[PDB]
């Protein structure tokens, strides 16, 4: 199993939408269970502290095991800016595929900065 976010960007302003282009493949012998995108606040040990707006752009049965999709992912306008997080904490855009009913996973989790471009 594999998954890539093909059009990465480093930052986003809360309230904006990221137009994700995502390639995934469940892998030979596997069946896609879902593809999920969720914004996470992490600590310095890469342990999740908060999860925001969990989405499942691929889900259900009869989905293609491998495809490239476009998916608009929104950051709520009131999620705290990166500069206002506790020391060492950061945002990670979790982008991942589950195969075989959560039997195995792969990810293209990508660090992102939430900032206010007016400031
Ligand atoms: Ca990666």
Q: How was this one solved?
A: X-ray
Neighbours of ion ligand 1 (CB under 5 A): 108
- How many Å lie between the centroid of ligand 1 and the Cα of residue 111? 10
As a whole number of angstroms, the distance between CA 89 and CA 96 comes to 21
- How many Å lie between the centroid of ligand 1 and the Cα of residue 109? 6
Which residue from 97, 110, 28, 101 is spatially nearest to 68, judged by alpha carbons? 97
| Cβ–Cβ < 8 Å for 70, 19 | yes
- How many Å lie between the centroid of ligand 1 and the Cα of residue 4? 7
List % helix, strand, coil for the chain (3-state, nearest 5): 5, 55, 45
- How many Å lie between the centroid of ligand 1 and the Cα of residue 100? 21
Domains of the chain: 2-114 (2.60.40.1930)
As a whole number of angstroms, the distance between CA 94 and CA 92 comes to 6
- How many Å lie between the centroid of ligand 1 and the Cα of residue 110? 7
Task: Check whether 70 is labelled as a binding-site residue.
Answer: no
How, if at all, do strands 32-42 and 110-114 pair?
A: unpaired
| Cβ–Cβ < 8 Å for 93, 54 | no
- How many Å lie between the centroid of ligand 1 and the Cα of residue 118? 30
- How many Å lie between the centroid of ligand 1 and the Cα of residue 115? 22
């Amino acid at each position: 199993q594999s998954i890539t976010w093909n059009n990465k960007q480093t930052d986003i302003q809360p309230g904006e939408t990221i137009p994700l282009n995502i390639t995934y493949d469940a892998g030979v012998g596997n069946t896609v269970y879902y593809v999920s995108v969720v914004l996470q606040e992490m600590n310095a040990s890469w342990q999740t502290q908060n999860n925001y707006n969990t989405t499942y752009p691929v889900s259900g049965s009869n989905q293609p095991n491998a495809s490239t999709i476009d998916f608009n992912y929104t950051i709520d306008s009131n999620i705290p800016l990166s500069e206002n997080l506790p020391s060492g904490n950061f945002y990670l855009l979790k982008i991942f595929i589950s195969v075989n009913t959560d039997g195995a996973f792969a990810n293209d989790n990508t660090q992102i900065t939430l900032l206010n471009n007016l400031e």
